[PDB]
Design a protein around this ligand. Structure first.
Ligand SMILES: COc1nc2c(Nc3ccccc3C(C)(C)C)c(C(=O)O)cnc2cc1-c1c(C)noc1C
Length: 127
């Protein structure tokens, strides 16, 4: 079985918090990206078996995807907004590292990242 286990989306020992910034990340940022027409390759872990990408998890050792991020937010997995922002950045970076510049999947990622940065520029202050 050559896919790794997916990133965890819950952990009984990891402290849980809700902040208005994490609420914004779920309700505005994730929602906007999730429903975007380019989102679908990013909505679940890369299935390197089904996609016939045998080298994927030889190259990418910190996988991340919006399905995992969405569940982490829904599960209050994150303590702060930076943890979630880091996961989005990891997802984009992995795409830019594994694929060739100018590939369609890279252009899709770049479009999602542009929207992402726009929404993060508008992050609300903590209540
Ligand atoms: C090419 O990069 C991906 N492609 C798919 C994918 N199929 C797809 C999508 C667009 C263009 C080309 C393809 C191939 C069929 C050639 C793989 C699918 C799918 O068809 O279900 C799902 N998830 C992906 C994640 C990724 C991906 C992401 C996201 N980051 O790195 C990789 C690799």
């Amino acid at each position: 079985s050559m896919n790794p286990p997916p990133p965890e989306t819950s952990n009984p020992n990891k402290p849980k918090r809700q902040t208005n910034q994490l609420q914004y990340l779920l309700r505005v940022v994730l929602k906007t990206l999730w429903k975007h027409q380019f989102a679908w390759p990013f909505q679940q872990p890369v299935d390197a078996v089904k996609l016939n990408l045998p080298d994927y998890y030889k190259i990418i050792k910190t996988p991340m995807d919006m399905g995992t991020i969405k569940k982490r937010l829904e599960n209050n997995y994150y303590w702060n907004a930076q943890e979630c922002i880091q996961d989005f950045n990891t997802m984009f970076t992995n795409c830019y590292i594994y694929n060739k510049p100018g590939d369609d999947i890279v252009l899709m990622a770049e479009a999602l990242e542009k929207l992402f940065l726009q929404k993060i520029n508008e992050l609300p202050t903590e209540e």
